[PDB]
Design a protein around this ligand. Structure first.
Ligand SMILES: *[C@@H]1O[C@H](CO)[C@@H](O[C@@H]2O[C@H](CO)[C@@H](O[C@@H]3O[C@H](CO)[C@@H](O)[C@H](O)[C@@H]3O)[C@H](O)[C@H]2NC(C)=O)[C@H](O)[C@H]1NC(C)=O
Ligand SMILES: *[C@@H]1O[C@H](CO)[C@@H](O)[C@H](O)[C@H]1NC(C)=O
Lengths: 35, 49
């Protein structure tokens, strides 16, 4: 309904709190799943 | 420009921005205006007649 709005993405302040956690746990997956 | 030219250089700004700030001067943010810009801006047109 608003006039003059433009499409723009909104960043999440919670996003930096989760990007640094996925890398650590990825290594352990290959050490236990294959055997 | 609005209120800005009483202090010096007048700054180009669209009108719909201006009175949307005067809403911030009574206690309601822009949510009142833009969510009803079509009707709200139309009433002032009729009020002048
Ligand atoms: C997110 O951004 C997209 C742009 O990638 C917005 O969608 C597109 O908005 C433009 C606005 O001009 C639309 O263009 C118009 O399309 C009509 C119909 O073809 C045409 O007759 C006009 O001359 C004009 O070109 C475009 O159609 C539209 N695309 C789609 C797929 O809807 C979208 O509105 C933005 N969304 C938000 C939530 O910001
Ligand atoms: C992967 O598993 C082996 C099994 O003995 C272990 O020695 C090694 O420390 C593990 N890797 C890491 C990064 O802990």
């Amino acid at each position: 309904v608003v006039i003059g709005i433009v499409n723009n993405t909104v960043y999440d302040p919670l996003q930096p709190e989760l990007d640094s956690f996925k890398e650590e746990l990825d290594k352990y997956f290959k050490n236990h799943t294959s055997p | 420009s609005g209120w800005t030219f009483g202090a010096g250089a007048a700054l180009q700004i669209p009108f719909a921005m201006q009175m949307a700030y005067r809403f911030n001067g009574i206690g309601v943010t822009q949510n009142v205006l833009y969510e009803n810009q079509k009707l709200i801006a139309n009433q002032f047109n009729s009020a002048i007649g």
